[PDB]
Ligand binder design. Structure first.
Ligand SMILES: O=c1ccn([C@@H]2O[C@H](COP(=O)(O)OP(=O)(O)O)[C@@H](O)[C@H]2O)c(=O)[nH]1
Ligand SMILES: O=c1ccn([C@@H]2O[C@H](COP(=O)(O)OP(=O)(O)O)[C@@H](O)[C@H]2O)c(=O)[nH]1
Ligand SMILES: O=c1ccn([C@@H]2O[C@H](COP(=O)(O)OP(=O)(O)O)[C@@H](O)[C@H]2O)c(=O)[nH]1
Ligand SMILES: OC[C@H]1O[C@](O)(CO)[C@@H](O)[C@@H]1O
Ligand SMILES: OC[C@H]1O[C@](O)(CO)[C@@H](O)[C@@H]1O
Ligand SMILES: OC[C@H]1O[C@](O)(CO)[C@@H](O)[C@@H]1O
Ligand SMILES: [K+]
Ligand SMILES: [K+]
Ligand SMILES: [K+]
Lengths: 791, 781, 163
């Protein structure tokens, strides 16, 4: 409680520090972020501030300032993952620190005004099993932590080793036996068997194939899965002997990663139009889709090599479960089963939504799918049962509906589970927790937040794309972190939602497919076949549903952006910033890609957003400096489009109020296009300001706009400046975001957590019942509440 | 015997789609077959121990109870043999299909408490059922034994212990086991040289210096004993020493008792619907609890004045009663008061009496109001909270939670066992009884409470052949609502059997002449023997000299009084041998209660149909315990008998009352009375499901006593002795207070693991009870 | 074994602290000062030390940030520059959080420790000339001379590197 002291500085700086604590009261009955809490009386103050001493502590890091009756409460975040909540009152003295459940009480009085036995969700009791890291370093590093604990627990405890034995003893695929046979009933014989094997094997030649000694092995109790040749079987036998004797983290991870485990993979991505063509840019259809497609291709390749290396011929299968939309014309979304491009074993598997009145045909927004998901789970269980040979080895959920379903599916089928958020709506729609009720009929946030909290704790491990997605930065709160303590007044109060230190978080950074996106400077690789099309797309004088307005001057650098068109993407905002700044309009041309104007739009935000764009063109008279391009569905041509922007020596700008990750940011950089990205969410981590690109603030756009004008201004003066950043980006990407290590990491995690799952089954039993009841008595009602779509 | 089982399994299939109990399963099956039985082998016992068999067309499911508390679930195809092991959840699937046509939703709620309670290891022995404090003592004893980290809780506890700002036990001076150690030895030498009887005022100055606050004892001798106990605990803990100490520390000062339903008062109530043994029990209880409470507070050298509040509902419009006043002193006590708070809604307070089955929508606000009202009355917060029955337990839990107080619960009955198949058939019963609400609260308070007090062993684990009241709540289902895979464990250490008794000043042997209250005889004579038929008593007894077959109780379906009348009505021999006297119902007013109203018609009709006039006297509710005691003794004078023909009886205070008076008793074998009476020794059991035999059995008793008068006196004596041994209020107060101490402390140690169970129950109350409760239609004035 | 016994057992970690706190040579205090009495302030200080150092230029000499260090309870021996002090501190933080064998060893090996060494070889004619081949005078003598020479180079090296 140190941060409740630096504020006691009222005794020193009083006649000043009770001013900023006033000019906040002069806002009233609300809450505001650092942007507001800070940029209020602090900057708007007078040199009678001179508060740059001890007090800048709490202001500089205070997440939200919530104004109320005489009392104002602050939320102060000294370090990522550590929270102290405080309230003093305005003019008056006596500022006392608040408990978490209590600070929320104060937030709820800000809306409803006052339900005693109204529910509290607390997960902290339900996990104390393994301890948790207090160290920044282990956030998103959880597997490294679990390893070290697992290593310790395993070290010379007879009983403690038995789990590992049973694991390898039961383990099997499609009825075929792998690793250890039923002959090994205890550590004694396993110790002995392994030893005899190493004897025999150490003697034979390096390249000797398993088939040779399979005879002997089968005799002594060893089935396949140890390796393809003797050299590899030896290594694996040693690894195990070593975990029996003196376990260590590097070994445990290595051995567990190596055991053949993952053959059938199930991936949930229900909402949106999920396809390989004619989709991207549509509502709800975006980076999650791209990510899963690159993901399975990579995953397949790694799986194949692992299987081969371990002495198995098994055929892997990966299914992406999504929804069957029979009426989406010009897409493949109507076909049950579809092969993923450039894979032997990866298939999209489509299953329809239905009610007792039969299947539901029309596309439904991701916010409205809730009522449909439980039946989807049942039906998908059945379909994936048909296609799969054996059961799922790994289930990965995606986003809220995907995570909701994958939890149900994994409980049902008893399979290791992973979740990937891809975004968390609560950070994208500010104060949508406190203000949820008035948003519900439109966004139904009550169901989503529930599905999120549900899946988050239900899953075995969680993958994130950045550190920021978990704990954010030193200044700002993380995406998951913001779920630790929050309330939805009138519904329930989440006292501990999730813990930024939970050993289950793992950061595995995706990448962009390198055959699609490469440096604009490799001429041999450029796709020139596309230049006619692109010349038309950017520079033609025809205005239509494909593109709006016109570029008068074809030689200017292009300021480029591409995205789904919804309010958070903020494309309209950028269009405004550009509109108002005359120096920038002078230097560059604006080209925005988003929304599909070929068809009438069924999405609320999209529709709204098209209205603003239409207006803004008229307001700022954008014709001749602006080109508004409709959704571009082909990634291949997209790669060449990015590179083309490079030829003009332009930039990529991503002006989102919040961006959970931002693949377009990764894409642009990969092509060598200097990128200005929003500082809210993932791109804050992706880009190193000044080195691999620049940050801008969607909340100060007029500044964003003039920053861009500075950049272009510098490059005209010193063209090497453009090249400097281009290279910075190219490097950042090579260093951080690439698909190669991804799959290896993912498979290894599945191995570790899979075994962990079996040791720790006994203490998660309570949390399982807790979560069962939450879903049953909280989710199901909220979902049934949601209006059905009408065909 | 592969050719045989296929047969009984056929006979059992012929009964079709249903469940059958052992009363039927094997009752029809085994004997009703051919001489092919030859069953004295192993497969016989399996059936013989089967509690119920649920039969569907291809399969039959079997719940098998080898020993109390021990269940196996199996399925068998009625052809092809192939017995198959079954999980509790899978066996329950069967019940759900049997009713709704299909199992409950794939993702519909399964309540499972097993993973929660598991903090402490389960006793496997019959002996520890009902004996849980004994087990928790051996556990704490061990956990405490030479463990630094484990002794700290006892220090912390004793250090924070206070009442109303007056510090107790250890002061803030003692920060560690070392100074506590040193100080206790220092304190030991000092008190060793002093005269036994030296008062705590003398060495009080000394103790304060070394950090010892008040409550160790009233005199030196007592402070000495206690300090030595603690030394032992710090040194070599053992179960007896641990308990004794924990029971000695002054703890209970304020006590809050929850009993919201019925007309709860000291006069003019008993026999009113919902008003019965629970009221009697609580009144006798507070009285005795106060005595012991004063006793202990004095002994530990404290001056605090106790308070005991019985929270019940304010009924403004009940006339002739005191149920309309907010505060009432309990007769024969200094500190016990009834505290009434009204039911209310947004619309304002609700006046009319409401049945126990209907109160649910009111219970939450009641709690809030109650809290506010007992905050005004009590000095300090409650040191103990006792829930009573379902609505009382429900409210006792919410209060305990709100105020952070040690919670005990007493069921007094569990409806699921009173209304057979009311779990599986719950849906069609709900508009009337609202069992979805009730069962929900039962399960909820059962687990939410710190400890549980029962009046019999049978109330927990039943008997060897039959299931127990709680035991029946372990696995059950309510098709369409939710499934309870593990709801309670008969071996749970929180169970404690503490038997209540009959007030000894009100009930005693009929043979003590000095004590008989003769001033009543004039009244009683008119009551039993007068020629007047009115709302007070119906029909008339023709021969005043016959022995009287006597029963008295609340009048409802389960008390089965209309049953007894019919049995007696059919049987001529019984009728000649004695007169039937039934006390039940208050016919002075119009009956506002469903069962009672219907039960009255049944009664009236029987009277006509069996020509009961001259053998039968139907008396209205006798609301005064004092005269009632004498009424009992009068039945004795005639050399009659008490009979209690309930279909199920949770405990049976009447049975106790009868026996205490020396009146030979025949009671139902279904529920508590089965344990209370020892057939042929303390009285006799009858089976309410075979009435004509119950009757014949009675006729036999009377025929015997006529040929051998001293046979009446044998059973009389046997009843008296049985009571002297098992049911009396004396020890009750000690046990209850001790328990509150042991469990109070365990609270602080085990707190880590009840945090999980606490959040589980919070969600269950919030998302399950509330919605159910609110669904119940509100009363209208 | 240590790596495992050291994982989140407080009663286990204290010894490491006592070690570093009592550790001194020739009247000069090393590693942790007496101002650090428990794992709590140890964890606090180390963290406070990390944040600060993370900002300084890699080759910054211990002398610069020494003043600050002495305040928060840190004495000499962590390293000669900021880079080396950074790692050493990061390692220790690790042993407190998630102990692993590589870390445990690497750290215990880095703590400046061996300064004075006593070697026992009583029998034989032990000298650097006119001896080898005499009775009892043999490889042991040859071994030991080679050893100390090698050992001295390392000890100087390690003393220098730890500042
Ligand atoms: O009209 C469009 C809009 C979207 N994209 C692609 O969609 C993805 C968007 O991912 P991002 O994470 O940047 O935004 P999200 O949709 O996930 O919120 C990127 O691969 C874009 O190249 C596209 O190809 N054409
Ligand atoms: O008309 C009546 C009916 C009941 N009782 C008393 O109510 C209690 C009934 O308790 P028991 O446990 O036998 O039955 P319960 O009503 O609790 O189900 C006994 O003290 C009876 O003497 C009474 O005094 N008058
Ligand atoms: O006349 C001699 C004999 C021995 N040596 C040296 O003494 C050592 C003998 O060591 P070794 O381990 O071979 O045998 P040890 O004497 O230890 O038994 C070797 O360095 C020899 O070169 C020598 O220098 N001159
Ligand atoms: O919330 C952003 C949306 O875009 C996606 O990436 C899909 O393209 C999903 O994560 C989500 O539907
Ligand atoms: O269920 C039996 C009924 O009788 C009582 O004992 C009170 O007389 C209550 O517990 C309940 O209302
Ligand atoms: O046995 C070997 C002998 O030679 C030595 O190496 C000394 O040169 C000693 O170890 C021992 O005296
Ligand atoms: K196997
Ligand atoms: K105390
Ligand atoms: K030191």
């Amino acid at each position: 409680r140190e941060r409740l002291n630096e504020t006691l500085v009222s005794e020193r700086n009083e006649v000043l520090a009770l001013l900023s604590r006033v000019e906040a009261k002069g806002k009233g009955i609300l809450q505001q972020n650092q942007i507001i809490a800070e940029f209020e009386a602090l900057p708007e103050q007078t040199r009678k501030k001179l508060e740059g001493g001890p007090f800048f502590d709490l202001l500089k890091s205070t997440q939200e300032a919530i104004v109320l009756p005489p009392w104002v409460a602050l939320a102060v975040r000294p370090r990522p993952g550590v929270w102290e909540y405080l309230r003093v009152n305005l003019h008056a003295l006596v500022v006392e620190e608040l408990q978490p459940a209590e600070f929320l009480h104060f937030k709820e009085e800000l809306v409803d005004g006052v339900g005693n036995f109204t529910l509290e969700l607390d997960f902290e009791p339900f996990n104390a099993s393994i301890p948790r890291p207090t160290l920044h370093k282990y956030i998103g590093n959880g597997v490294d932590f679990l390893n070290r604990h697992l290593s310790a627990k395993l070290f010379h405890d007879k009983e403690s080793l038995l789990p590992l034995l049973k694991f390898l003893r039961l383990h099997s695929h499609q009825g075929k036996n792998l690793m250890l046979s039923e002959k090994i009933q205890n550590l004694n014989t396993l110790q002995h068997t392994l030893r005899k094997a190493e004897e025999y094997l150490a003697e034979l030649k390096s390249e000797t194939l398993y088939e040779e000694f399979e005879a002997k092995f089968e005799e002594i109790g060893l089935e396949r899965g140890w390796g393809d040749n003797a050299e590899r079987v030896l290594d694996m036998i040693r690894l195990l002997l070593d975990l029996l004797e003196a376990p260590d983290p590097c070994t445990l991870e290595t051995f567990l990663g190596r055991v053949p485990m993952v053959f059938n993979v199930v991936i949930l991505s229900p909402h949106g139009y999920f396809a390989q063509d004619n989709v991207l840019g549509y509502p709800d259809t975006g980076g999650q889709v791209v990510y899963i497609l690159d993901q399975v291709r990579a995953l397949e390749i790694e799986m194949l090599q692992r299987i081969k290396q371990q002495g198995l011929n098994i055929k892997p299968r990966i299914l992406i479960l999504t929804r069957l939309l029979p009426d989406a014309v010009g897409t493949t979304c109507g076909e049950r089963l579809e092969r993923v491009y450039d894979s032997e074993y990866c298939d999209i598997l489509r299953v329809p939504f239905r009610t007792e009145k039969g299947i539901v045909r029309k596309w439904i927004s991701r916010f409205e799918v809730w009522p449909y998901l439980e039946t989807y789970t049942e039906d998908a269980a059945v379909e994936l049962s048909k296609e799969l040979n054996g059961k799922p080895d790994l289930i990965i959920g995606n986003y809220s509906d995907g995570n909701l379903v994958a939890s149900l599916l994994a409980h049902k089928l008893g399979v290791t589970q992973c979740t990937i958020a891809h975004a968390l709506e609560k950070t994208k729609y500010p104060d949508s927790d406190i203000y949820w009720k008035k948003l519900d009929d439109k966004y139904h946030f009550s169901c989503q937040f529930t599905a999120d909290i549900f899946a988050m704790n239900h899953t075995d491990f969680i993958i994130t794309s950045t550190f920021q997605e978990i704990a954010g930065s030193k200044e700002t709160v993380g995406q998951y972190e913001s779920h630790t303590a929050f309330t939805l007044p009138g519904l329930y109060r989440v006292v501990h939602g999730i813990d930024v230190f939970d050993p289950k978080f793992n950061i595995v950074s995706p990448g962009a497919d390198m055959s699609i996106y490469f440096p604009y400077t490799e001429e041999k690789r450029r796709l020139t076949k596309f230049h006619s099309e692109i010349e038309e797309l950017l520079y033609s004088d025809v205005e239509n549903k494909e593109h709006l307005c016109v570029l008068k001057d074809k030689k200017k650098p292009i300021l480029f952006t591409m995205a789904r068109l919804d309010r958070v993407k903020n494309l309209s905002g950028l269009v405004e910033w550009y509109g108002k700044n005359t120096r920038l309009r002078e230097l560059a041309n604006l080209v925005v890609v988003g929304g599909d104007r070929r068809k009438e739009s069924k999405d609320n935000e999209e529709k709204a957003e098209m209205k603003k764009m239409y207006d803004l063109i008229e307001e700022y008279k954008l014709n001749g400096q602006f080109r508004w391009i409709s959704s571009q569905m082909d990634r291949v041509r997209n790669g060449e489009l990015y590179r083309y922007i490079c030829d003009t020596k332009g930039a990529f700008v991503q002006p989102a109020l919040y961006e959970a990750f931002g693949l377009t940011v990764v894409e642009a950089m990969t092509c060598g296009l200097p990128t200005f990205a929003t500082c809210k969410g993932g791109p804050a981590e992706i880009i190193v300001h000044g080195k691999s690109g620049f940050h801008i603030d969607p909340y100060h756009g007029d500044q964003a706009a003039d920053t861009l004008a500075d950049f272009f201004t510098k490059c005209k003066e010193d063209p090497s400046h453009w090249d400097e950043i281009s290279k910075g980006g190219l490097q950042r990407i090579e260093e951080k975001y690439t698909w190669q290590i991804y799959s290896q990491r993912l498979l290894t995690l599945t191995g570790v957590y899979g075994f962990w799952k079996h040791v720790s089954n006994l203490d998660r039993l309570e949390a399982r019942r807790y979560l069962e009841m939450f879903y049953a008595l909280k989710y199901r009602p909220l979902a049934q509440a949601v209006p059905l779509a009408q065909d």
